[PDB]
Scaffold this active site. Structure first.
Site, PDB file in Angstrom:
ATOM      1  N   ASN A 113      -4.650 -55.396  29.804  1.00 13.03           N
ATOM      2  CA  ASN A 113      -4.467 -55.580  31.332  1.00 13.03           C
ATOM      3  C   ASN A 113      -4.947 -56.909  31.502  1.00 13.03           C
ATOM      4  O   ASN A 113      -6.209 -57.218  30.927  1.00 13.03           O
ATOM      5  CB  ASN A 113      -5.115 -54.592  32.108  1.00 13.03           C
ATOM      6  N   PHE A 117      -8.617 -59.752  38.757  1.00 13.09           N
ATOM      7  CA  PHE A 117      -9.275 -59.373  39.563  1.00 13.09           C
ATOM      8  C   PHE A 117      -8.495 -59.489  41.243  1.00 13.09           C
ATOM      9  O   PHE A 117      -8.780 -59.818  42.113  1.00 13.09           O
ATOM     10  CB  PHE A 117     -10.522 -60.215  40.146  1.00 13.09           C
ATOM     11  N   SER A 183     -15.626 -59.090  33.034  1.00 12.72           N
ATOM     12  CA  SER A 183     -14.087 -59.020  32.975  1.00 12.72           C
ATOM     13  C   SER A 183     -13.839 -60.076  32.164  1.00 12.72           C
ATOM     14  O   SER A 183     -14.305 -61.288  31.798  1.00 12.72           O
ATOM     15  CB  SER A 183     -13.676 -59.521  34.289  1.00 12.72           C
ATOM     16  N   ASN A 185     -10.744 -61.295  32.071  1.00 19.22           N
ATOM     17  CA  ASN A 185      -9.671 -62.213  32.596  1.00 19.22           C
ATOM     18  C   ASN A 185     -10.156 -62.927  33.807  1.00 19.22           C
ATOM     19  O   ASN A 185      -9.387 -63.242  34.915  1.00 19.22           O
ATOM     20  CB  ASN A 185      -8.698 -60.981  33.352  1.00 19.22           C
ATOM     21  N   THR A 186     -11.313 -63.403  33.763  1.00 16.42           N
ATOM     22  CA  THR A 186     -11.905 -64.344  34.749  1.00 16.42           C
ATOM     23  C   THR A 186     -12.785 -65.605  34.103  1.00 16.42           C
ATOM     24  O   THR A 186     -13.635 -65.202  33.479  1.00 16.42           O
ATOM     25  CB  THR A 186     -12.839 -63.760  35.888  1.00 16.42           C
ATOM     26  N   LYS A 223     -22.482 -54.248  34.523  1.00 16.52           N
ATOM     27  CA  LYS A 223     -21.470 -53.738  33.383  1.00 16.52           C
ATOM     28  C   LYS A 223     -21.110 -54.919  32.478  1.00 16.52           C
ATOM     29  O   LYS A 223     -21.085 -56.048  32.747  1.00 16.52           O
ATOM     30  CB  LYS A 223     -20.318 -53.563  34.310  1.00 16.52           C
ATOM     31  N   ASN A 252     -17.055 -52.545  29.509  1.00 12.93           N
ATOM     32  CA  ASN A 252     -15.690 -53.179  30.036  1.00 12.93           C
ATOM     33  C   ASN A 252     -14.756 -53.106  28.474  1.00 12.93           C
ATOM     34  O   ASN A 252     -14.951 -52.588  27.771  1.00 12.93           O
ATOM     35  CB  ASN A 252     -15.998 -54.554  30.383  1.00 12.93           C
TER      36      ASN A 252
HETATM   37  C1  FMN Z   1      -5.648 -51.572  34.178  1.00 14.58           C
HETATM   38  C2  FMN Z   1      -7.288 -51.507  34.284  1.00 14.58           C
HETATM   39  C3  FMN Z   1      -7.746 -52.277  35.360  1.00 14.58           C
HETATM   40  C4  FMN Z   1      -9.316 -52.447  35.430  1.00 14.58           C
HETATM   41  N1  FMN Z   1     -10.049 -53.095  36.230  1.00 14.58           N
HETATM   42  C5  FMN Z   1     -11.442 -53.179  36.217  1.00 14.58           C
HETATM   43  C6  FMN Z   1     -12.155 -53.782  37.276  1.00 14.58           C
HETATM   44  O1  FMN Z   1     -11.533 -54.066  38.375  1.00 14.58           O
HETATM   45  N2  FMN Z   1     -13.444 -54.039  37.103  1.00 14.58           N
HETATM   46  C7  FMN Z   1     -14.054 -53.188  35.958  1.00 14.58           C
HETATM   47  O2  FMN Z   1     -15.473 -53.408  36.064  1.00 14.58           O
HETATM   48  N3  FMN Z   1     -13.349 -52.561  35.073  1.00 14.58           N
HETATM   49  C8  FMN Z   1     -11.948 -52.660  35.044  1.00 14.58           C
HETATM   50  N4  FMN Z   1     -11.458 -52.109  33.981  1.00 14.58           N
HETATM   51  C9  FMN Z   1     -12.085 -51.577  32.813  1.00 14.58           C
HETATM   52  C10 FMN Z   1     -12.417 -50.066  33.058  1.00 14.58           C
HETATM   53  O3  FMN Z   1     -13.310 -49.769  34.247  1.00 14.58           O
HETATM   54  C11 FMN Z   1     -13.203 -49.506  31.649  1.00 14.58           C
HETATM   55  O4  FMN Z   1     -14.539 -50.381  31.482  1.00 14.58           O
HETATM   56  C12 FMN Z   1     -12.508 -49.788  30.283  1.00 14.58           C
HETATM   57  O5  FMN Z   1     -10.987 -49.723  30.597  1.00 14.58           O
HETATM   58  C13 FMN Z   1     -12.706 -48.907  29.275  1.00 14.58           C
HETATM   59  O6  FMN Z   1     -12.591 -47.367  29.659  1.00 14.58           O
HETATM   60  P1  FMN Z   1     -11.277 -46.543  29.258  1.00 14.58           P
HETATM   61  O7  FMN Z   1     -10.984 -47.083  27.885  1.00 14.58           O
HETATM   62  O8  FMN Z   1     -11.390 -45.189  29.647  1.00 14.58           O
HETATM   63  O9  FMN Z   1     -10.037 -47.454  30.213  1.00 14.58           O
HETATM   64  C14 FMN Z   1     -10.112 -52.019  34.198  1.00 14.58           C
HETATM   65  C15 FMN Z   1      -9.477 -51.394  33.057  1.00 14.58           C
HETATM   66  C16 FMN Z   1      -7.966 -50.956  33.096  1.00 14.58           C
HETATM   67  C17 FMN Z   1      -7.049 -50.328  32.050  1.00 14.58           C
HETATM   68  O1  ORO Z   2      -9.032 -57.187  36.960  1.00 16.18           O
HETATM   69  C1  ORO Z   2      -8.864 -57.390  35.735  1.00 16.18           C
HETATM   70  O2  ORO Z   2      -8.094 -58.007  35.244  1.00 16.18           O
HETATM   71  C2  ORO Z   2      -9.916 -56.752  35.139  1.00 16.18           C
HETATM   72  C3  ORO Z   2     -11.180 -56.915  35.570  1.00 16.18           C
HETATM   73  C4  ORO Z   2     -12.412 -56.160  34.468  1.00 16.18           C
HETATM   74  O3  ORO Z   2     -13.674 -56.370  34.831  1.00 16.18           O
HETATM   75  N1  ORO Z   2     -11.977 -55.441  33.429  1.00 16.18           N
HETATM   76  C5  ORO Z   2     -10.688 -55.456  32.933  1.00 16.18           C
HETATM   77  O4  ORO Z   2     -10.292 -54.919  32.060  1.00 16.18           O
HETATM   78  N2  ORO Z   2      -9.753 -56.053  33.819  1.00 16.18           N
END
Ligand code: FMN
Ligand code: ORO
Ligand code: ILC
Length: 364
Positions: A113, A117, A183, A185-186, A223, A252
């Protein structure tokens, strides 16, 4: 509902009819409306954990990103999560990157992804949480805490102030805050993980947190990414100790692309989550636990889809775990599955409960 039904029929059908982002939006909708399968599993005392100044009914939470704007908090508790984390939330509202910006890698049980943000902004989320502030107070007292993940705006000229604003606005409504400097993506966000900048940033964040009234003073966690160098990790551990940071969320998503990915979309830009990230995350938890001498609570995240995945992170040093990607593949039933399997494994391995297993690998 049924674990097998969702995994083999419902989820597959949904993914075949809707693109990833549309499927997510629908997910948030259904969850906010409580349209969820029966939450069979009953949390046993074995799963209870006390950390970060709070009691957690069970150690399985929903990771940041699923409910970015705090629209489905209650539905998520109904799903069985022991705690909910919303966000990331940015000071001002922003759209994020153009679509498509999320991709499925079915063959890898992973997702990539690059949302960037997308956020309704602090004000909107603030009022949304205030509308259920007392309801949350009771939930928290009952062992179901709420975490708020803070981000920064793309065009911000002062990263530290963006986080400071988030502390002041949502800090009074959260049990814990997350300074998300990982993140992928920032542009330049991850650079905030450097020692010099990190210390300055966190010092400001903690001062703002300490300035809040007692009952509205949240714990503060950082994080981190799974792509840090050994030096980066040493520095983060040092600063965390120096400033008294309350905890760490590890990890993350990863910007790495492990050898072996099969998905056709493996080379899309963005953060990779799911199974391919699992062990990289577990090893990061292991290292941070050791570097902090096990004195800093860690929330383990990354590729958790079963009780074994959860316990490996707990044994590596996590006091709590979170998941997101597993939900996108298996649906709501995965929460109960993870908890049921975790409970069974704890018993099988001679642990009186989750607490006894935290960091167990380091003591063998
Ligand atoms: C679609 C998507 C959006 C995410 N958005 C955020 C976010 O806004 N902030 C954040 O700290 N992590 C974000 N994450 C990361 C998750 O919180 C997590 O750290 C990471 O995906 C690992 O866990 P998982 O393998 O169970 O998904 C996002 C992940 C995905 C897949
Ligand atoms: O918003 C996103 O694109 C994003 C933020 C973040 O902290 N981690 C991630 O996987 N996506
Ligand atoms: C009635 O049954 C239900 C009830 C409540 C929630 C869901 C559901 C549906 C889809 C997703 N999926 C994602 O939210 C997602 C995020 C990023 S990608 C991606 C995806 O589908 O590929 C979910 F998590 C949960 C299904």
């Amino acid at each position: 509902g049924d674990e097998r039904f969702y995994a083999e029929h419902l989820m597959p059908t949904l993914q075949g009819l809707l693109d990833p982002e549309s499927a997510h939006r629908l997910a948030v909708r259904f969850t906010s409306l409580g349209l969820l399968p029966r939450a069979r599993f009953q949390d046993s005392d074995m799963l209870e954990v006390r950390v970060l100044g709070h009691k957690f009914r069970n150690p399985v939470g929903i990771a940041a990103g699923f409910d970015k704007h705090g629209e489905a908090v209650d539905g998520l508790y109904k799903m069985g999560f022991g705690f909910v984390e919303i966000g990331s939330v940015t000071p001002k509202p922003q759209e994020g990157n153009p679509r498509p910006r999320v991709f499925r890698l079915p063959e890898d049980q992973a997702v990539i992804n690059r949302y960037g943000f997308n956020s309704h902004g602090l004000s909107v989320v603030e009022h949304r949480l205030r509308a259920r502030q007392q309801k949350q107070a009771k939930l928290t007292e009952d062992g179901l805490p709420l975490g708020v993940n803070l981000g920064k705006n793309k065009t911000s000229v002062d990263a530290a102030e963006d986080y400071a604003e988030g502390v002041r606005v949502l800090g009074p409504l959260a049990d814990y805050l997350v300074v998300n400097v990982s993140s992928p993506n920032t542009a330049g966000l991850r650079s905030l993980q450097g020692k010099a900048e990190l210390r300055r940033l966190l010092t400001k964040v903690l001062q703002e947190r300490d300035g809040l009234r007692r009952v509205h003073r949240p714990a503060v966690l950082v994080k981190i990414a799974p792509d840090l160098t050994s030096q980066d990790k040493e520095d983060i551990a040092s600063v965390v100790k120096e400033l008294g940071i309350d905890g760490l969320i590890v990890t993350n998503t990863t910007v790495s692309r492990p050898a072996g990915l099969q998905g056709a979309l493996r080379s899309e830009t963005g953060g990779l989550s799911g199974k391919p990230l699992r062990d990289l995350s577990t090893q990061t938890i292991r290292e941070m636990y050791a570097l902090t001498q096990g004195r800093v609570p860690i929330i383990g995240v990354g590729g958790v889809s079963s009780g074994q995945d959860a316990l490996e992170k707990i044994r590596a040093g996590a006091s709590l775990v979170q998941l997101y990607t597993a939900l996108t593949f298996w649906g709501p039933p995965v929460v109960g599955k993870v908890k049921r399997e975790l409970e069974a494994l704890l018993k099988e391995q001679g642990f009186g409960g989750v607490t006894d297993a935290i960091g167990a690998d380091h003591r063998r």
